[PDB]
Design a protein around this ligand. Structure first.
Ligand code: ZN
Ligand code: ZN
Lengths: 302, 302
């Protein structure tokens, strides 16, 4: 097919505000993002987790947009976010369906020092790459990065995963529960400018094939825990606020409260991402180790 | 008068962690905090809120160490905090009584870029002013700004106020539930000078008269609201991260998504503190407006 329905989701993580704020307005006086040809839909996904201003109320709405969850049946009892992903399947989905959106945006914010981050789901996404390639470009001088989740497994449950062509937008760093006017713009640069690439492409303009060499999630790093339970050695003052950068074998990683360091394994370079992210602390996670692995595509016309 | 009982409270609020980690580490080895001729019991105040990375369970434990709560007898219906408060007032109390603990340091991290902050409740009171001075100088050459809560009423409700000499230790920026090697180091050093301090004083060190620059809250400034009540504007950009620095009448104080700027007002200089604190949306306030006033202490000697 072609294009059609477009969405901007804000509120999947209720206490990620610069990703959320804007939407509340684009329901109030949405004139701020509607163009002369293209069609974009702004929607707040987890209203209740927004109001409290809290990651979630029953379960991560961001890990339940798939069979596994979507498929479960009607019980006013069920965990709030479930029934929510379900219904969400009617407005912009269902997922894997046909009438369901092809361009939705799942806006977020992190605590790790990451700056502009576009998230790619499957690698074989010729288009998405032209875009993830046409965003990085339309961005300079302000830095932008592409994160890839290559599930060999081959299955996603994300909120944005209802659309033909999903796109994750994340901006760091913005403490959960806070709203920095700076982050409310450290990112406006692709949206209303993306709402563009999702129109202009139509004219059938073409660019040479594509190969964004991204950083791909390959293995999450654990927190060196003491004994009884509690931590032992935390993110070192050298890795801190160093996402997307190399971490060779000497590079410190974890610093113990008694003063010691704990360096990197192997001898191959990596660019840690999601360094010291608030959420995932209950997961005993310090960061995701990444190899700046490659991504070639193919040219595209409309 | 010679000091004997000294407790370092941490985990007071659940998001804040530098103290949960520090306290615990000492609870296993206070060598760094033990002093000759003193007793320093590190203690976690809100065990539970620490487990559900909440700011708490029922309500804040930094607002109930007063006669209304203190006048309640222990029970089931009695909510968690009210219950725990007592146990601390039992353990480190009863209150305003000499029967209780001498000095208590309670640690707190903030999302505002404010660095090393000492919190004093009442100014006129020569005892606890020299201490802060010794810290300002011993912790140098990094700001170690001091914040005041002058209550002409002459009253306080901080978990730390059980002590005959309450001392607040706040440090930012270190997101809620995300511990940074660095932040933990500033506080680590603040505590040193403070513990050691009591040590040479206890061992009769004489001290000459001194004075300290401080900031008094003079107007909790709020974020603009909406038609009904929603947050219209927000903290301004150029102000973000400028806690403690000078704010004149016509300088940017806020902003609105339609690019609009809202100015300060009044006819004098103010020093915004707690500029964009995560808990402030909840404790309401875009930032605290304060005056820099001088406190002059008399020379003390044990
Ligand atoms: Zn998120
Ligand atoms: Zn606190």
């Amino acid at each position: 097919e072609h294009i059609q329905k477009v969405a901007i989701f804000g509120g999947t993580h209720g206490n990620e505000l610069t990703g959320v704020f804007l939407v509340k307005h684009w329901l109030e006086n949405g004139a701020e993002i509607q163009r002369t040809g293209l069609e974009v839909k702004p929607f707040i996904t987890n209203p209740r987790a927004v109001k409290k201003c809290t990651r979630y109320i029953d379960c991560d709405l961001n890990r339940i947009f798939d069979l596994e969850n979507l498929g479960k049946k009607m019980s006013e009892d069920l965990p709030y976010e479930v029934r929510r992903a379900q219904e969400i399947n009617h407005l912009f989905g269902p997922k894997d369906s046909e009438d369901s959106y092809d361009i939705i945006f799942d806006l977020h914010n992190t605590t790790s020092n990451m700056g502009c981050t576009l998230i790619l789901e499957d690698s074989r996404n010729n288009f998405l790459i032209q875009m993830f390639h046409y965003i990085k470009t339309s961005l300079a001088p302000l830095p932008c990065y592409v994160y890839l989740i290559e599930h060999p497994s081959l299955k996603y449950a994300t909120t944005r995963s209802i659309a033909k062509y999903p796109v994750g937008i994340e901006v760091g760093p913005q403490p959960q529960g806070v709203l920095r006017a700076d982050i409310l713009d450290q990112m406006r640069k692709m949206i209303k400018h993306a709402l563009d690439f999702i129109h202009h492409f139509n004219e059938g303009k073409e660019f040479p094939p594509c190969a964004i060499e991204v950083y791909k999630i390959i293995e999450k790093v654990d927190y060196p825990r003491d004994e009884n339970g509690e931590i032992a050695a935390i993110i070192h003052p050298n890795l801190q606020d160093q996402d997307w950068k190399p971490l060779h074998p000497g590079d410190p990683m974890f610093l113990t409260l008694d003063g010691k360091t704990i360096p990197l394994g192997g001898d191959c370079t990596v660019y840690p991402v999601f360094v010291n992210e608030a959420a995932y602390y209950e997961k005993k996670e310090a960061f995701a180790k990444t190899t700046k692995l490659t991504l070639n595509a193919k040219s595209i016309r409309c």
